[PDB]
């Protein structure tokens, strides 16, 4: 029998244990599942338009605070009066402002120029960031159609054009569709066809980070397999510069002097940031690039503070500690906190005490305290995400950035503990035994304090193999306009001339799987990085040299026509067989199908010239009984290659003997049947 | 142990079963936990307060 009570209850035990080993990893993946950040998008103060451009504004210590924008038609004269209490005046004489938020590409999306004119600059800079963060991740933005993909956008209600009551001259029905943050997450999920939760978050200076929290949750629950979190604060009006000045909180210089004694206000800046969030298991299983990992995010409120605007200390300590508890980590684990650093000599004191309480109380090494707003300015709903791009660039470059205007440490903060070192110099922050962790803090004017934990991506990417191949994979690119077609080859040429040594097959794979098929396509098969950057230098001007150019809107499925006679040369397929394994296998199969009925094996025939037969007193491929099998063999092998490279037929046309290939490749007859 | 051939592994199975119960109830108190509508307040049209 079964060795009574020793081979069953021990057999039932391994399943009450392993199911438990499986029902707990479910709780740990339902609550502490580390979500990956697949890709980065940012339009930040200054010249920053891409996540790699933000690093040489952040690593060499450049402040983005330059001045108020002039593109927007701002008054700029009633904004500044000597009387500080004059209604309609602003106190800050600058700030980091976007120089490209005024412009947009209407024809690129399904957007009319009039509708795009009615679109909020936040909502027009968010669609472009979504497209960028999808194209950065190797995920075709048109491939996510009717798929679960949440959109979580942090926003600030900003006055744009005329009163909705007064309507407009051209913007009558689209003015709501711009000046409502409602569609500021639904528009993105509509143009890209995303089906997951399109949620707009509004908690002011913490929105984006609160947003990513929600996105993180939507990943740790399984509602959406992917999320696009982040936040935008683009200012089309000086309105809150006028209004933040009335409470006397803006820094006259517009600079966020975070944790500095020379601070005279919290400053202001406009920006936008976007994170492509996916759970680590899904991110690595699908092959999506993992930059860093959001492990735990907490969102809390300041409670009954000293007013709605004043921050709270205990609530900040509670949210920073809750983020660590939900991430399963502790104070020491975080190697570099990048807290709000509002910029004022009131918020910074309170928040540094909270940092010293949640972190500095129990520290093994000095926590590297930083603030992105020092380099950029207070980006509000773009703050909470901008710090996340900072840290992710910090771990993808292995350096802890400076905090500008922080040489004079604040006298109102007790730094005598030494557990917190303000990042006034670039501290080397290399990969080591400890998983490199850090934490982003954002405390909004609404009182909602939020904190996220960013660990370095587990370094399991290492282990890739190397090889070489003769397959010249096409370098395919596409844009929505002819000028954009000439600009997607110039920027790629600039990238391959400024980032040299990137192997051509990697470039072809990234250009092919990761770029949407748009209705202006340029494609060339490179042989060298000098014969490709030359084509990319002719495609930038419009000259189609060594490439193929085409406008092909409303065209997705191809027909396979089969010509009959005409290539009497027949000295072609030798190279294809000698260089393509598929042509070296399908040809063998169809020949061995032809041999039982026609003894001629196409293999000796293949290795020859066009005048080979002429030497033996015979015209180029003239013997019908010997020629028809070889066209059939080469033809079916060519069709098999074309179907092996992803091109499948829609209809089939056979001129004279292409009917046999119609029998073979379309499944009507087998290789043996059609060969016979 | 002494009687038949199970006085130990039978307890390990019992606790393991109880834990699995207590960890599977955690899943259903984390994703499907009913959320009671403790109260409702409204200012809707028609003088409704």
């Amino acid at each position, epitope marked *: *029998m*079964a*060795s009574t009570d*020793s*081979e*069953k*209850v021990a*057999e*039932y035990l*391994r*399943r*009450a244990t*392993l*199911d438990l080993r*499986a*029902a707990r990893q479910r709780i740990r993946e339902l609550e502490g599942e580390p979500v990956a950040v697949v890709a980065m998008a940012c339009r930040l103060p200054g010249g920053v338009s891409t996540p790699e451009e933000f690093w040489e504004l952040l690593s060499e210590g450049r402040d983005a605070v330059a001045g108020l924008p002039t593109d927007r038609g701002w008054d700029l004269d009633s904004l500044f009066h000597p009387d500080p209490t004059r209604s309609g005046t602003a106190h800050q004489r600058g700030g980091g402002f976007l120089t490209e938020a005024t412009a947009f590409d209407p024809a690129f999306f399904g957007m009319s120029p009039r509708e795009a004119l009615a679109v909020d600059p936040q909502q027009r800079l968010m669609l472009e960031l979504s497209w960028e963060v999808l194209e950065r991740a190797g995920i075709p933005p048109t491939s996510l159609q009717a798929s679960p993909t949440g959109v979580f956008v942090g926003l600030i209600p900003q006055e744009y054009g005329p009163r909705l009551a007064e309507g407009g001259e051209g913007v009558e029905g689209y003015l709501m569709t711009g000046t409502t943050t409602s569609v500021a997450s639904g528009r993105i999920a509509y143009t890209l066809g995303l089906e997951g939760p399109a949620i707009s978050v509004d908690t002011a200076c913490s929105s984006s980070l609160v947003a990513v929290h929600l996105a993180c949750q939507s990943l740790r629950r399984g509602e959406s397999s992917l999320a696009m979190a982040g936040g935008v604060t683009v200012m089309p009006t000086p309105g809150m510069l006028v209004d933040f000045s009335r409470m006397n909180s803006l820094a006259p210089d517009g600079r966020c002097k975070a944790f500095s004694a020379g601070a005279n206000g919290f400053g202001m800046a406009e920006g936008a940031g976007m994170l492509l969030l996916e759970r680590l298991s899904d991110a690595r299983r699908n092959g999506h690039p993992v930059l860093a990992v959001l492990r735990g995010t907490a969102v809390n409120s300041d409670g009954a503070s000293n007013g709605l605007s004043a921050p709270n200390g205990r609530a900040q300590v509670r949210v920073i500690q809750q983020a660590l508890a939900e991430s399963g980590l502790g104070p020491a684990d975080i190697d570099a906190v990048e807290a709000h650093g509002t910029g004022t000599r009131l918020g910074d004191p309170i928040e540094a005490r909270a940092l010293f309480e949640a972190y500095g109380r129990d520290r093994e090494q000095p926590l590297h305290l930083g603030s992105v707003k020092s380099n950029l300015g207070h980006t509000q709903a773009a703050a909470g995400v901008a710090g996340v791009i900072k840290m992710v660039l910090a771990m993808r470059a292995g350096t802890l950035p400076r905090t500008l205007h922080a040489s004079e440490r604040s006298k109102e903060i007790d730094w005598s503990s030494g557990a917190i070192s303000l990042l006034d110099e670039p501290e080397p922050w290399p990969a080591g035994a400890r998983p490199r962790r850090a934490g982003v803090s954002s405390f909004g004017i609404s009182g909602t304090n939020a904190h996220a934990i960013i660990e370095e991506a587990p370094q399991v990417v290492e282990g890739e193999r190397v090889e070489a191949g003769d397959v010249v994979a096409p370098w395919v690119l596409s844009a929505s306009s002819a000028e954009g077609l000439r600009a997607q080859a110039a920027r790629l040429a600039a990238h391959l001339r400024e980032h040299p040594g990137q192997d051509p097959r990697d470039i072809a794979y990234s250009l092919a799987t990761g770029r949407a098929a748009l209705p202006h396509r340029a494609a060339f098969a490179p042989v060298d990085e000098s014969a490709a950057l030359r084509v990319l230098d002719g495609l930038a001007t419009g000259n189609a040299d060594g490439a193929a150019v085409g406008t092909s809107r409303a065209q997705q499925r191809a027909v396979f026509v089969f010509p009959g006679q005409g290539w009497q040369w027949a000295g072609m397929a030798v190279d294809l067989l000698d260089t393509s394994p598929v042509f070296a296998a399908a040809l063998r199969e169809c020949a061995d199908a032809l041999e039982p009925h026609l003894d001629f094996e196409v293999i000796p025939f293949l290795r020859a010239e066009a005048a080979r037969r002429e030497q033996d007193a015979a015209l180029s491929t003239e013997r019908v009984d010997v020629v028809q099998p070889v066209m059939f063999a080469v033809m079916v092998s060519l069709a098999s290659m074309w179907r092996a490279h992803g091109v499948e037929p829609a209809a089939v046309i056979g001129h004279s003997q292409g009917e046999i290939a119609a029998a073979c490749v379309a499944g009507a007859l087998s290789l043996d049947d059609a060969a016979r | 142990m002494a009687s*038949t051939d*199970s006085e130990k592994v*039978a307890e390990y*199975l*019992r606790r393991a*079963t109880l834990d*699995l*119960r207590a960890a*599977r109830q955690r899943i*259903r108190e984390l994703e499907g936990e009913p959320v009671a509508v403790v109260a409702m307040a409204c200012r809707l049209p028609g003088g409704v307060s």
Partner: antibody
Amino acid sequence: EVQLVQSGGGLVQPGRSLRLSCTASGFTFGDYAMSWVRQAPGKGLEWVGFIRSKAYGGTTEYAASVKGRFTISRDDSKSIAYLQMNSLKTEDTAVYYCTRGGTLFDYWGQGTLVTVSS
Amino acid sequence: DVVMTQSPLSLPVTPGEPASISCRSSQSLLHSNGYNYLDWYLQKPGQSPQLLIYLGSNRASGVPDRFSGSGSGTDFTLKISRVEAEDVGVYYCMQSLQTPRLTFGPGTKVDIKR
């Protein structure tokens, strides 16, 4: 994950020998007791046999009908379980299943359709 | 002797309905451990069987919650809270008191009800 990939199909006549190989991937092979269960066409399961775990003696227990002929063996080093089918009669024309437990048949593998016809 | 078991061989189910499949055993499957030693199994149409429930009531990992098990030492009942196309097939009632296991029994033939 866990898989119980199977092999050993083919053609046999009444009075021949056959091999059913089960490869387990995902967990330690030595502490599970292998079992072979059969699917007669038209009905559900009937259990063929079970070998004890390596540390539980590794002794075998088959059904009276297939006692001896249907030998059950296993091995950890290459992690493989053998059902050697001997003198397959025409009542052995069935879908055999590699089960992951002497009393707890968990994964059931895939199922090999063994045919015994003249 | 042997614990020979019976079940509702031809129990019908319909989409959107909770179903109650049962098993009856001659002897008592409740061991001195206090744990019922019954197993519920599901065979899909033309696929490998799967282990739904062990020890009378508890799940196997990966088996949806839509199956629940209960019952006394003799009578055992599995309720499907919500039947679907994946909850169709053959349900096997397995005793773990005596193993030799000659056959799996008649099995409950489950079909979508019209």
